[PDB]
PDB file of C-alpha atoms in Angstrom:
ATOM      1  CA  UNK A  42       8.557 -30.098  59.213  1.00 52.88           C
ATOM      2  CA  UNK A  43       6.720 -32.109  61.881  1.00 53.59           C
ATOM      3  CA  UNK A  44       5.540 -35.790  61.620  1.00 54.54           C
ATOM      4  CA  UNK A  45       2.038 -36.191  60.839  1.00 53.54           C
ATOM      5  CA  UNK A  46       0.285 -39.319  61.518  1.00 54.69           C
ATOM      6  CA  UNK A  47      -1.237 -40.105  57.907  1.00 56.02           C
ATOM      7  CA  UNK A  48       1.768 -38.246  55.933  1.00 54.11           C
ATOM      8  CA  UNK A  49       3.919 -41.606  57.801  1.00 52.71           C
ATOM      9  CA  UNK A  50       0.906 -44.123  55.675  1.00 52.68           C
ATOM     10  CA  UNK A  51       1.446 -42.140  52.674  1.00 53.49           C
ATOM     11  CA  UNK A  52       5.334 -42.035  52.072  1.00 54.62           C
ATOM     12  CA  UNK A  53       5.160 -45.791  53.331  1.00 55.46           C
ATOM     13  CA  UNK A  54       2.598 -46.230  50.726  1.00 55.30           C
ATOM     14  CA  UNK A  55       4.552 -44.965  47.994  1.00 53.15           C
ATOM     15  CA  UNK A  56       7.620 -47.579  49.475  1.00 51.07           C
ATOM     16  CA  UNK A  57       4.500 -50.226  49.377  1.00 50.27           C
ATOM     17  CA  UNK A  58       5.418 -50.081  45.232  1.00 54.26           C
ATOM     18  CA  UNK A  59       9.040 -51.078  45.802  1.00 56.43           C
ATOM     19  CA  UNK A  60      10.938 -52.396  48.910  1.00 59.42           C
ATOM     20  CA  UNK A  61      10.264 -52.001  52.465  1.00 55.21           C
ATOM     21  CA  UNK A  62       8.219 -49.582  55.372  1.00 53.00           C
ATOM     22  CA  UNK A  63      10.338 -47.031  56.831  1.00 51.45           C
ATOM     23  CA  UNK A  64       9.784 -45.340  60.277  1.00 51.37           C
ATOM     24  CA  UNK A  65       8.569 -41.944  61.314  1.00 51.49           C
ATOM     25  CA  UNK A  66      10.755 -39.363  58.662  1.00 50.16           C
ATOM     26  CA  UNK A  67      11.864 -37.337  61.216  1.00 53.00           C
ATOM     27  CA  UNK A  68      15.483 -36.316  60.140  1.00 54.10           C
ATOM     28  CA  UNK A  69      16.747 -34.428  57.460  1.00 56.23           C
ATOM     29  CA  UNK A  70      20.217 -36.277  56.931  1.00 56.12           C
ATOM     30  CA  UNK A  71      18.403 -39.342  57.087  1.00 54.15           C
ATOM     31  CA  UNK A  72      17.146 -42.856  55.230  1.00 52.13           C
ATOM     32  CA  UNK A  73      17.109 -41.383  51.921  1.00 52.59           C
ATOM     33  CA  UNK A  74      14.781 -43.337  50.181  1.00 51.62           C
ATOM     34  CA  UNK A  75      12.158 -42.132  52.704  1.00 54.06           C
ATOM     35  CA  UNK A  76      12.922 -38.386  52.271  1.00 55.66           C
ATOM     36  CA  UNK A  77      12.844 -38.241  48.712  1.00 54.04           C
ATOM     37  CA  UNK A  78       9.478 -40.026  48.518  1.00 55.53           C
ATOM     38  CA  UNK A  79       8.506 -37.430  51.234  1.00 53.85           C
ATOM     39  CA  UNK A  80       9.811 -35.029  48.960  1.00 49.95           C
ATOM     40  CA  UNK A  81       7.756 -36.462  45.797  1.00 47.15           C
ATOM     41  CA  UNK A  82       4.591 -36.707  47.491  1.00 44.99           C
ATOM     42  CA  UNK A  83       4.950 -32.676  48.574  1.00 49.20           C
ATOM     43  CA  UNK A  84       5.783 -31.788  44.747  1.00 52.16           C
ATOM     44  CA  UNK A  85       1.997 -33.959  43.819  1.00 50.41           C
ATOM     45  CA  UNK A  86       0.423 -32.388  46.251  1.00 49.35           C
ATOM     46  CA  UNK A  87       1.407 -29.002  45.315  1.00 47.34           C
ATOM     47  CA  UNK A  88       0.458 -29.509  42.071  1.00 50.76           C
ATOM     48  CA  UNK A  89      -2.688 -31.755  42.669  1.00 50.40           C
ATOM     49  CA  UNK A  90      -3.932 -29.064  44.577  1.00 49.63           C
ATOM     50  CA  UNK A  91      -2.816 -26.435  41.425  1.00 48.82           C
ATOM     51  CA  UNK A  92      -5.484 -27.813  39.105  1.00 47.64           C
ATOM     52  CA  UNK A  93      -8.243 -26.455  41.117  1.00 50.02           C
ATOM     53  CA  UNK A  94     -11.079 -27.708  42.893  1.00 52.92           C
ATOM     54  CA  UNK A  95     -14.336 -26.601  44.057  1.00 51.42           C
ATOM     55  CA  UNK A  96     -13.395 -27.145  47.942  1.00 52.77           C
ATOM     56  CA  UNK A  97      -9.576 -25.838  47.357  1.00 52.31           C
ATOM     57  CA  UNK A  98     -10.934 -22.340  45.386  1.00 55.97           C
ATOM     58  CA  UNK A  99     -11.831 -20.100  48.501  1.00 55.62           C
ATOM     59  CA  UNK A 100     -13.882 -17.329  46.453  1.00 56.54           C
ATOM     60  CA  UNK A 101     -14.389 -14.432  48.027  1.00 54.46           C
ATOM     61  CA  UNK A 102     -11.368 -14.144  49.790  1.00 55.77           C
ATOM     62  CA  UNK A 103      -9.667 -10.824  50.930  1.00 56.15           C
ATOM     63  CA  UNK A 104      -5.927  -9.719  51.669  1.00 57.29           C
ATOM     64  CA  UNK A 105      -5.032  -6.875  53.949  1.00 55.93           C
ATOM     65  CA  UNK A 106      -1.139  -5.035  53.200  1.00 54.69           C
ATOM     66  CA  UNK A 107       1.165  -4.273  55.744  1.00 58.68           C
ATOM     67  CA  UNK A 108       0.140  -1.145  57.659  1.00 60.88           C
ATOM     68  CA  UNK A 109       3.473   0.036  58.020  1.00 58.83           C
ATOM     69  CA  UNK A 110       5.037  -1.590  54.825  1.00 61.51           C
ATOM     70  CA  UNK A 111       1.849  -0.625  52.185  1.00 64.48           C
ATOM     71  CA  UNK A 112       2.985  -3.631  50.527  1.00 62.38           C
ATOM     72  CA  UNK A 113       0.424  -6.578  50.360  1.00 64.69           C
ATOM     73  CA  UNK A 114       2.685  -9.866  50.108  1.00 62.21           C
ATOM     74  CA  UNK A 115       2.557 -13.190  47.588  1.00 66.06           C
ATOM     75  CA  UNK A 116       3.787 -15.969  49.262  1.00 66.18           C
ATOM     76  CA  UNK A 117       4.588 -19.560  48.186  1.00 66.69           C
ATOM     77  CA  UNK A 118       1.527 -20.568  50.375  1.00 61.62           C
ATOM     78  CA  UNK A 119      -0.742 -18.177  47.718  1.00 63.15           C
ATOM     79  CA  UNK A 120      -0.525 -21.064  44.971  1.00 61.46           C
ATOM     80  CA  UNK A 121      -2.428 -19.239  42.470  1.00 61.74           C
ATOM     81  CA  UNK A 122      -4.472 -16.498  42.423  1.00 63.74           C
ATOM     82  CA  UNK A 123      -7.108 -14.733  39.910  1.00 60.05           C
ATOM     83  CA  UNK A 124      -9.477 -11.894  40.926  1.00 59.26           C
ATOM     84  CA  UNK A 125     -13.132 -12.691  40.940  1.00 58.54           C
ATOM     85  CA  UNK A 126     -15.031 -11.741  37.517  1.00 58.82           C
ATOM     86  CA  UNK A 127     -12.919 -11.642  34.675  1.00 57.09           C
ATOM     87  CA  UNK A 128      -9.228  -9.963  33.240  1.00 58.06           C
ATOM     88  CA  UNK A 129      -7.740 -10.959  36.168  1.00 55.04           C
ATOM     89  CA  UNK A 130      -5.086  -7.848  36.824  1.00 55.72           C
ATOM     90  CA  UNK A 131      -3.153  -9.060  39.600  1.00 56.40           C
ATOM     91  CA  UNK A 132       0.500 -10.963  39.159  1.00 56.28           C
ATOM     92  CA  UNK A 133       3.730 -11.516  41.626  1.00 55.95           C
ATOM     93  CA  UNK A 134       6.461  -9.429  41.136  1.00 57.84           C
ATOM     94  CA  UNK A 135       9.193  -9.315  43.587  1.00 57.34           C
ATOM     95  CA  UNK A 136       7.143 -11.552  46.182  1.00 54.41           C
ATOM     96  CA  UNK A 137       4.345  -8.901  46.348  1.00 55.37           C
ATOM     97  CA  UNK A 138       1.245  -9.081  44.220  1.00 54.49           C
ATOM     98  CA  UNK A 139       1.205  -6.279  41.918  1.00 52.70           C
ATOM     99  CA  UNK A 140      -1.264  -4.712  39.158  1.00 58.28           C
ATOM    100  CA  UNK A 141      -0.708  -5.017  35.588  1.00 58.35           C
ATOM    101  CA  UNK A 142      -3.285  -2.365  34.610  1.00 56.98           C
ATOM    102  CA  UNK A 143      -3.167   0.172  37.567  1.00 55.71           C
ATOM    103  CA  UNK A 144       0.580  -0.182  36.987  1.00 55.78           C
ATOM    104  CA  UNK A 145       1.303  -0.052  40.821  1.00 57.81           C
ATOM    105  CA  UNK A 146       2.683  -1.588  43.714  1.00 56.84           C
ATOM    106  CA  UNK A 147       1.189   0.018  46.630  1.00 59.86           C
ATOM    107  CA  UNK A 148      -1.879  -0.529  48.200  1.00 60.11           C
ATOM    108  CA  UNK A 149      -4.355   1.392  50.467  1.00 62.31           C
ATOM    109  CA  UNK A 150      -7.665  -0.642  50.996  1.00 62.55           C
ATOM    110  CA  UNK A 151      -7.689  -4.773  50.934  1.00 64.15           C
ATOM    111  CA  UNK A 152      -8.049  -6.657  47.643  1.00 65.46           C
ATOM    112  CA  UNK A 153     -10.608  -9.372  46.705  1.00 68.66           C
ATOM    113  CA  UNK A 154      -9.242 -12.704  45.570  1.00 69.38           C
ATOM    114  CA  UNK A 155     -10.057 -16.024  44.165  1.00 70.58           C
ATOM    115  CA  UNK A 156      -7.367 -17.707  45.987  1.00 69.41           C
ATOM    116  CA  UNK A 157      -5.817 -21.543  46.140  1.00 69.17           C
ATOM    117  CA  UNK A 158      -4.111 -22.449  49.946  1.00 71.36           C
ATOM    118  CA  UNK A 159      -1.481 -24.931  49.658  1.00 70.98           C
ATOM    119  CA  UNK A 160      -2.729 -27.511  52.453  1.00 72.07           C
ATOM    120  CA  UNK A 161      -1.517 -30.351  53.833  1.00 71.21           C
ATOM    121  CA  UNK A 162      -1.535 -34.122  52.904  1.00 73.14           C
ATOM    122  CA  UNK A 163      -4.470 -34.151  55.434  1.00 75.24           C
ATOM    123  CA  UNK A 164      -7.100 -31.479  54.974  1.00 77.39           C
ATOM    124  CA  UNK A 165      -7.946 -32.812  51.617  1.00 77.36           C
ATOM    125  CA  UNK A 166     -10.753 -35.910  50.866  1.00 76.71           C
ATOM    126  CA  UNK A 167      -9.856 -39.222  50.483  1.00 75.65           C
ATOM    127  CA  UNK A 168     -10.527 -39.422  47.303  1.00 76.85           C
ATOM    128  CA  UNK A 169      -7.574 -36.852  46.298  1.00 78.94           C
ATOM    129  CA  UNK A 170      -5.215 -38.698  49.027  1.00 79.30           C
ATOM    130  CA  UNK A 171      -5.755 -42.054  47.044  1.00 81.50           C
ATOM    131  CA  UNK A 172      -5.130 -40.154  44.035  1.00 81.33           C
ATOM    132  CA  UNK A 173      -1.829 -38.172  45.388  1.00 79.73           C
ATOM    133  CA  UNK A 174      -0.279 -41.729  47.008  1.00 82.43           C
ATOM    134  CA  UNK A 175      -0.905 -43.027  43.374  1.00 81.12           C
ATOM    135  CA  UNK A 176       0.668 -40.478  41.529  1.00 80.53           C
ATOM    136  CA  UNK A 177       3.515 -39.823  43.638  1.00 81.11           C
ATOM    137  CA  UNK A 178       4.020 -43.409  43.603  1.00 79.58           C
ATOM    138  CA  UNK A 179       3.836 -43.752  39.676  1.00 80.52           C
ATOM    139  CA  UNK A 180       6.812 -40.700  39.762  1.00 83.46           C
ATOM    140  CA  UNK A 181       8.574 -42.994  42.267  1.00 81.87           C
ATOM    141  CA  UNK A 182       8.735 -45.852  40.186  1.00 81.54           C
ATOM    142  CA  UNK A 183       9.545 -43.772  36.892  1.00 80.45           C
ATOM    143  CA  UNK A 184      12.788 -41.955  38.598  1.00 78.35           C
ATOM    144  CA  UNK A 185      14.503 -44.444  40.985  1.00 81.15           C
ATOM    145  CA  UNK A 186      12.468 -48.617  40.573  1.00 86.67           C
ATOM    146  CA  UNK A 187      12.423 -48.296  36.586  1.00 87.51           C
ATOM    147  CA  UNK A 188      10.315 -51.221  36.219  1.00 91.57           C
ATOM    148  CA  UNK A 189       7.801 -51.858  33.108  1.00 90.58           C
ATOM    149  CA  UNK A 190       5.075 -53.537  34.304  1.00 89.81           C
ATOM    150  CA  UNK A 191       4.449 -51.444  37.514  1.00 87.11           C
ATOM    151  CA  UNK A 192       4.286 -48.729  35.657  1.00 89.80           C
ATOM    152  CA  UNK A 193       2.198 -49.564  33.158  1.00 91.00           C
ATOM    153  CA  UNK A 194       0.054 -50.875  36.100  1.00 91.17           C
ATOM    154  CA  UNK A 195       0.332 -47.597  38.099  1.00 90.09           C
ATOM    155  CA  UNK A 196      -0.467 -45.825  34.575  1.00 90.25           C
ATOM    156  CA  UNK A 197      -3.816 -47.503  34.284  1.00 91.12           C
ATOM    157  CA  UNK A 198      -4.248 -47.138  38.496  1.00 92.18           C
ATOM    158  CA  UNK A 199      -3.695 -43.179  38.138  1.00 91.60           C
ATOM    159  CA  UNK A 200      -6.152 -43.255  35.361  1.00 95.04           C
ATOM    160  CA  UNK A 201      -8.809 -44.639  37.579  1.00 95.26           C
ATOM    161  CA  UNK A 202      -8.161 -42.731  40.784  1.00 98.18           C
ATOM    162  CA  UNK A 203      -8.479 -39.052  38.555  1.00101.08           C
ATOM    163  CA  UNK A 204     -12.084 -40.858  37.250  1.00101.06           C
ATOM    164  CA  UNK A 205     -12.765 -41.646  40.668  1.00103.10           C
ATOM    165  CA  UNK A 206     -11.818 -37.816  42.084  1.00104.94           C
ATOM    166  CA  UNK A 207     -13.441 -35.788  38.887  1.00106.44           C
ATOM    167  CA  UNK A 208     -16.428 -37.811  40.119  1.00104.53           C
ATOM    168  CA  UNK A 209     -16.158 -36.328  43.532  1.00103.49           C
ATOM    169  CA  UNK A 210     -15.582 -33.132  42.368  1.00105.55           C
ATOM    170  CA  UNK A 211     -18.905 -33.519  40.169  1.00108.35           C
ATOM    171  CA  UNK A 212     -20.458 -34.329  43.236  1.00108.35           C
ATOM    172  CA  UNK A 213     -19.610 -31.642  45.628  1.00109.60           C
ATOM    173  CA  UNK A 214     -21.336 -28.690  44.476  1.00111.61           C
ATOM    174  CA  UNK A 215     -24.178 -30.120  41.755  1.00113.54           C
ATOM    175  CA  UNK A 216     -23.465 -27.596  39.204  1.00109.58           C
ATOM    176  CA  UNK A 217     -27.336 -27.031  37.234  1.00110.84           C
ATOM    177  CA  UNK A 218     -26.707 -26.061  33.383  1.00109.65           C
ATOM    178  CA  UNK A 219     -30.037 -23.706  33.763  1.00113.56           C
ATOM    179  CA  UNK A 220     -30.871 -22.424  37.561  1.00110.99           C
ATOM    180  CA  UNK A 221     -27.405 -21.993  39.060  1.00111.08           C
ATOM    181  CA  UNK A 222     -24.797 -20.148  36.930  1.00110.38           C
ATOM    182  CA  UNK A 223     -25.089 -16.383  36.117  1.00109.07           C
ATOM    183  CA  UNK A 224     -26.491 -16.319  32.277  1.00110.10           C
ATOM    184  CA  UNK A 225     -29.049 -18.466  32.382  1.00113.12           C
ATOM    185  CA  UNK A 226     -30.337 -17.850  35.335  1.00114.33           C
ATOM    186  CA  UNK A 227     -32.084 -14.678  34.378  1.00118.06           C
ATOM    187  CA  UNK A 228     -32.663 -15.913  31.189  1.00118.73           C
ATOM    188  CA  UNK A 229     -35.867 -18.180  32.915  1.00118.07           C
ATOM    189  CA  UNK A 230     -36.915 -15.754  34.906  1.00122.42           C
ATOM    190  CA  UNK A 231     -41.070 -15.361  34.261  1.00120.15           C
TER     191      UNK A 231
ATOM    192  CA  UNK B 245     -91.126 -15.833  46.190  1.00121.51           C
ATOM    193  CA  UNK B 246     -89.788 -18.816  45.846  1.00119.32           C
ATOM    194  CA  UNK B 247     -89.141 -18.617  42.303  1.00119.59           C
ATOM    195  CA  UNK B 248     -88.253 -15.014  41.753  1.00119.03           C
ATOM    196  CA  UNK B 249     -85.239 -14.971  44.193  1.00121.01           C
ATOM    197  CA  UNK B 250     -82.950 -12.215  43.035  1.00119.38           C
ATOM    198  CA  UNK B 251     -79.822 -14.016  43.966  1.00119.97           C
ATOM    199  CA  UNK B 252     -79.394 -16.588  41.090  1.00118.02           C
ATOM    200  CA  UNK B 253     -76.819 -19.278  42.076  1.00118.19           C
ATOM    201  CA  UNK B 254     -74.710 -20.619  39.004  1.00117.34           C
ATOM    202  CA  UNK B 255     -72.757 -23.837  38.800  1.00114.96           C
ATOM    203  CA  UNK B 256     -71.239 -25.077  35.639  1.00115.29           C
ATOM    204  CA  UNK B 257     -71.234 -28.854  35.880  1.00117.11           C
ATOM    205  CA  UNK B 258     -73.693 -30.175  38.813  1.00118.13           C
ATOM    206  CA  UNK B 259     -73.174 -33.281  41.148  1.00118.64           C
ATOM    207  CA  UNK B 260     -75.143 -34.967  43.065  1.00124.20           C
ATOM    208  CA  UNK B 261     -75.299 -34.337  46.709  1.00125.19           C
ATOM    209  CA  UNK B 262     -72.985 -31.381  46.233  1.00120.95           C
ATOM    210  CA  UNK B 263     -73.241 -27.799  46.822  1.00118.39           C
ATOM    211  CA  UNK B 264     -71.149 -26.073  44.695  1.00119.04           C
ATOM    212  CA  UNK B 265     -70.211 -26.582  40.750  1.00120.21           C
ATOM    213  CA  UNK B 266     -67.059 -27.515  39.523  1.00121.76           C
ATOM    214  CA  UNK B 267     -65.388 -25.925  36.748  1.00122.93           C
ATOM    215  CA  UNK B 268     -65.410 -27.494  33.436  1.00124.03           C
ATOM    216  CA  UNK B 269     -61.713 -26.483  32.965  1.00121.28           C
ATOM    217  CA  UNK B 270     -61.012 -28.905  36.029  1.00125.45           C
ATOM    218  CA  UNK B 271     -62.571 -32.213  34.000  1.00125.30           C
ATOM    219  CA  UNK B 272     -59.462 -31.184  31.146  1.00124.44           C
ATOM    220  CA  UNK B 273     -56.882 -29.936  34.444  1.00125.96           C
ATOM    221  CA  UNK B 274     -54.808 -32.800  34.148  1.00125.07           C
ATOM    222  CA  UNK B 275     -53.916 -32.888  30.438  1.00123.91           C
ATOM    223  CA  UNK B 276     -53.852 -29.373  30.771  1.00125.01           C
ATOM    224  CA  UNK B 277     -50.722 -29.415  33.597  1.00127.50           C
ATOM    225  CA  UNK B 278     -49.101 -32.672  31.703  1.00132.43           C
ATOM    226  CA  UNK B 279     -49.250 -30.547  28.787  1.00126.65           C
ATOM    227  CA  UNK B 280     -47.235 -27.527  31.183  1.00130.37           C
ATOM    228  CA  UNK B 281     -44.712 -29.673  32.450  1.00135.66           C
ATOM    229  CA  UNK B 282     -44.146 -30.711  29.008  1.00135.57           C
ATOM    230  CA  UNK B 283     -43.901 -27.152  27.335  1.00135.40           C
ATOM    231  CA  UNK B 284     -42.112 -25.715  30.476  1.00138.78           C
ATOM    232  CA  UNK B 285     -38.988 -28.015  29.893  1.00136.89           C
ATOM    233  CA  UNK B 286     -38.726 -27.214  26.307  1.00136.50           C
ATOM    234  CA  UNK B 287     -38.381 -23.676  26.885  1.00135.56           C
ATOM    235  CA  UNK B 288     -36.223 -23.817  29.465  1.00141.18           C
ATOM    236  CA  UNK B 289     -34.285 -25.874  26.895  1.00136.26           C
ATOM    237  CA  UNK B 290     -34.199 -23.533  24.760  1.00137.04           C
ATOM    238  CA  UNK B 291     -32.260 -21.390  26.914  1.00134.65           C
ATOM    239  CA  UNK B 292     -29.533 -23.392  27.701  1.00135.62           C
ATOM    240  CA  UNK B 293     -28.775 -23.612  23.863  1.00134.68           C
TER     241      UNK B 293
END
């Protein structure tokens, strides 16, 4: 891809666990070590951004077909996607989302998604790039610097940066038991 | 007259230097609103369970 100024901190953050800074990425037959931690911190970020979150989850989202194809398309980018009540009914098949109750492929108005982007290392909080950097560099030291000790270190480390993150995500968007959900809201109406 | 005026003025509890009554409910308000507070929550308690 391109070089992006804090993706550079984060795969020299993951070498900060074993060995030495590297400069800049920006070659694909290249310093090895600093591709393949490039390439571990894309495979936690596309999963740390799979678990959902409530700044990740863009609701009410809609998704328009090709006019001349008829054929709305899944991508890689489309992470993972439910509809917006319940029994979600829509599934990739092919590359193109597709209906598992209407039993069809094509079709003719838009479609209303609860939808997870795939963003970058950057367009996330700090909180969840501390927690990325330390679990991309606990995989790091597990696969290529098998060490004991820094990984029992980078255990406990990982541990505390998901307490520290489920705490942000507890604190962006105060979720009330009793005046904010859809049950019990009507339930104290007077 | 003066003492056969038509228009009879009431007030519950007097004061002095005062021209109006207040309420006797007002003397028990306070209790009365802790006591609302206090039953509101447990209802709305109830519906969470």
């Amino acid at each position: 891809n391109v070089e992006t100024a804090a993706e550079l901190s984060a795969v020299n953050d993951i070498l900060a666990s074993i060995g030495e800074p590297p400069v800049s990425t920006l070659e694909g037959d290249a310093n090895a070590d600093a591709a393949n931690a490039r390439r571990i911190l894309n495979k936690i970020n596309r999963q740390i951004q799979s678990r959902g979150w409530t700044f990740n989850i863009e609701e009410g989202i809609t998704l328009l077909p090709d006019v001349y194809s008829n054929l709305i398309v899944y991508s890689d980018d489309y992470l993972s996607l439910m509809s917006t009540s319940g029994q979600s009914i829509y599934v990739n098949r092919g590359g193109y989302v597709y209906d598992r109750t209407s039993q069809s492929d094509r079709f003719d108005s838009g479609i209303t998604v609860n939808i997870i982007r795939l963003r970058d290392y950057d367009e996330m909080p700090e909180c969840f790039r501390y927690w990325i950097v330390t679990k991309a560099s606990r995989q790091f030291n597990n696969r290529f610097f098998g060490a004991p000790e820094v990984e029992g270190v980078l255990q406990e480390e990982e541990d505390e940066a998901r307490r520290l993150c489920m705490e942000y995500e507890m604190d962006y968007g105060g979720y009330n038991m009793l005046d904010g959900d859809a049950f019990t809201s009507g339930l104290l109406t007077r | 007259p003066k003492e056969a005026c038509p228009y009879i003025p009431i007030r519950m509890v007097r004061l002095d230097g005062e021209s109006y009554g207040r309420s006797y409910i007002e003397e028990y308000l306070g209790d009365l609103r802790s006591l609302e507070n206090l039953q509101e929550a447990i209802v709305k308690m109830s519906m969470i369970s």
